[PDB]
From Swiss-Prot, chains A, B:
Pathway: tRNA modification; tRNA-queuosine biosynthesis. The lineage of its organism: Bacteria, Pseudomonadati, Pseudomonadota, Alphaproteobacteria, Sphingomonadales. Belongs to the queuine tRNA-ribosyltransferase family. Binds 1 zinc ion per subunit. Its EC number is 2.4.2.29. GO terms for biological process: queuosine biosynthetic process; tRNA wobble guanine modification; tRNA-guanine transglycosylation. One of its GO terms (cellular component) is cytosol. Residues 247-253, 271-275 are annotated as: RNA binding. This is Queuine tRNA-ribosyltransferase. Homodimer. Within each dimer, one monomer is responsible for RNA recognition and catalysis, while the other monomer binds to the replacement base PreQ1. Its cofactor is Zn(2+). The gene is tgt.
Length: 369, 369
């Protein structure tokens, strides 16, 4: 039977790695893209469809599920896996992003954050909620530092997050069933500052985690800056554990982040922008609502192996999205998630074969032609 | 290979019949429920899912498709079947209901109806649009008489519909490809008046059609009145051709209509009310949004064989619908359409076995308990 947690690296090329995370509920192939299913659903897809696209793991969110339908309620109903019908690993974010994104609803202190009906999150309560959900990969309760941030404020925020990381570790470890069956990831903060990123990495490594997320990016800094920060930040993390870049991203963001040592990704882009009419293709994104697609009999993408591209035309999907039809959202979402998984597969295969740098070059040349 | 059209009756019980319609694109088991797919989609379902529920045929609509995406456009793209990915029979309504339901947009004359951007429908143009869509069962262009109607106005409307029925027949017959590959149904009108229903039936039988719809019902008259009209109206139609009750209906409406000799049904109830939170069960409809379902682990219906009832709880679907999640619409719709198909299967089997009257009694006793 599978272990609680084992990360193995099978092949490398430069800073890029490919391998597997084995967990009780399944194997996760890395680099991995994790579809976002915040409210106990990957929007517009049955779990079987999410799996058919190639996803090994999906995300839920402590903050949203705490509010609706409720963490205790989900536990009473048998846990998130049973509730939504996904039996493979689930990673749950801790609420630390919402501490920032919904800060106007908040009162913050060293103890935690109260959101206003009032709901409280703290390292202890966040870890408890993730336990009640039956999360496989539990995220430490952090604060995603706003961008831009002054060095003083970035330091204060990071320091608090590191104290919260230790509290998260201790809360997780004290709950035997959780400690024995789930994994815990720490989240590096420090904004765009190398010295703070180093202090954060050192603090997290001293505490010790099963994996390490790069937090505080994909918050408006832009790709050049994000890549600059990754250049120095990822090498600070333990090499032998997974590296998870939270919130990233566009296909080219993912490719460049893998080149910089990232193993795991989540983003709402394929799902949300799919519902909005944006389809990803190897020749770049298209907006299916555009009149130029009204009589286009080609599939969304000419090479894509997904069920949508096997069966339906751009013209039909154009009609559905223009008409506000639910099937339009379903088809766009399935295609985009499948596209993302095919990207990850090509990345994994190219690293395995020692031709990832060539893949990255070819990918960019065509995607941005 | 299958004929253009052949209706065979395999078994009877009282006025009820069960059998098959064979057409080039497939066999339709009768009594049949036909899911409504007005805008080239059965809302929230892939065609494969519609088929998996047991549907043999679906409906499209001349009026809606003429407006968006356009009839000529669909023809250019290869026809409605290819466009939406449903390769089995499709019945298209003619626009005659919209003549009534959207009458404020209209200017009516003996030639046809113009809807106001202006779009025209006439017997000739309606039949042409249905050809462009590649419809298998083409409906005559009629007017659904408003309810209530005075005897004078009901007569005038019916008489015009009968003149339009002859024009529909001639338009269909003059188009060789359509005449050789599709079927044409006439629509009986006459409101709630026996003498007018008789005149209409006689006129339609004289013209001759492949099947006969009972039009002008399910327009607010209520079940007692609808059944009273069916009692005398259905026997007026040719016995050896299918009888199609347009727009019906709730499960008990369907059962009573089959008892009165109806072979085919369409209704938006399972799809539309499903999206609104109403689930059909053998113990009557439930509204899944009700707080009583928030922690109910049972499936929507205790006996239902559908994929939704095999996998997900009332509690989960309650959460999805409350949250406005697309998957909620998908799951409710699949279940309701599957329920309707299971109802039709039970009806067909019970007639075949000579126990339909007992089935109707048992069904009602439990559904209305
Ligand atoms: C978009 N860029 C981005 N996402 C980020 C997320 C996930 C948000 C999470 O919130 C929900 O979406 C709103 C999703 O929850 C499943 C998502 O994974 C982060 N989470 C934490 N805990 N800390 C961070 O520093 C952080 C930074 C991010 N940057
Ligand atoms: C609900 N009761 C009801 N429906 C009816 C329909 C279908 C409406 C059609 O319009 C679209 O839905 C709005 C659907 O189109 C596929 C539906 O089948 C009718 N169609 C014609 N041609 N003539 C009638 O006398 C008539 C009467 C009806 N009573
Ligand atoms: Cl999303
Ligand atoms: Cl509908
Ligand atoms: Zn595709
Ligand atoms: Zn069901």
């Amino acid at each position: 039977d599978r272990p609680r947690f084992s990360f193995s690296i099978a092949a490398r090329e430069g800073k890029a790695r490919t391998g597997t995370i084995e967990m009780k509920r399944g194997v996760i192939r890395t680099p991995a893209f994790m579809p976002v299913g915040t409210a106990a659903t990957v929007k517009a897809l049955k779990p079987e469809t999410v799996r058919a696209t190639g996803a090994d793991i999906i995300l839920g969110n402590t903050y949203h599920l705490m509010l609706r339908p409720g963490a205790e309620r989900i536990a009473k109903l048998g846990g998130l896996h049973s509730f939504m019908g996904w039996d493979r690993p689930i990673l749950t974010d801790s609420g630390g992003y919402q501490v920032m994104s919904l800060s106007s609803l908040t009162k913050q202190s060293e103890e935690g954050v109260t959101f206003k009906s009032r709901h409280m999150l703290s390292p202890e309560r966040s870890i408890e909620i993730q336990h009640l959900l039956g999360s496989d990969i539990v995220m430490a309760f952090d604060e995603c530092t706003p961008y831009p941030a002054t060095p003083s404020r970035a330091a204060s925020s990071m320091e608090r997050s590191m104290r919260w990381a230790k509290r998260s570790r201790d809360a997780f470890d004290s709950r035997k069933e959780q400690a024995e069956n789930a994994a815990l990831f720490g989240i590096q903060q420090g904004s765009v500052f190398e010295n703070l990123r180093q202090q954060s990495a050192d603090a997290l490594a001293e505490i010790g985690f099963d994996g390490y997320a790069v937090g505080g990016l994909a918050v408006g800094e832009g790709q050049d800056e994000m890549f600059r920060v990754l250049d120095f930040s990822v090498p600070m993390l333990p090499d032998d554990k997974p590296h998870y870049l939270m919130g990233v991203g566009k296909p080219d963001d993912i490719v460049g982040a893998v080149e910089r040592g990232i193993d795991m990704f989540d983003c709402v882009l394929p799902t949300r922008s799919g519902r909005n009419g944006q389809a990803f293709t190897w020749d770049g994104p298209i907006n299916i609502r555009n009149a130029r697609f009204s009589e286009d009999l080609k599939p969304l993408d000419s090479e894509c192996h997904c069920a949508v591209c096997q069966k339906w035309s751009r013209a039909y999907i154009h009609h559905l999205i223009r008409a506000g039809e639910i099937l339009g959202a379903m088809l766009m979402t399935e295609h985009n998630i499948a596209f993302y998984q095919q990207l990850m597969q090509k990345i994994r295969d190219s690293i395995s074969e020692g031709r990832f740098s060539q893949f990255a070059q070819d990918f960019r040349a065509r995607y941005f032609a």
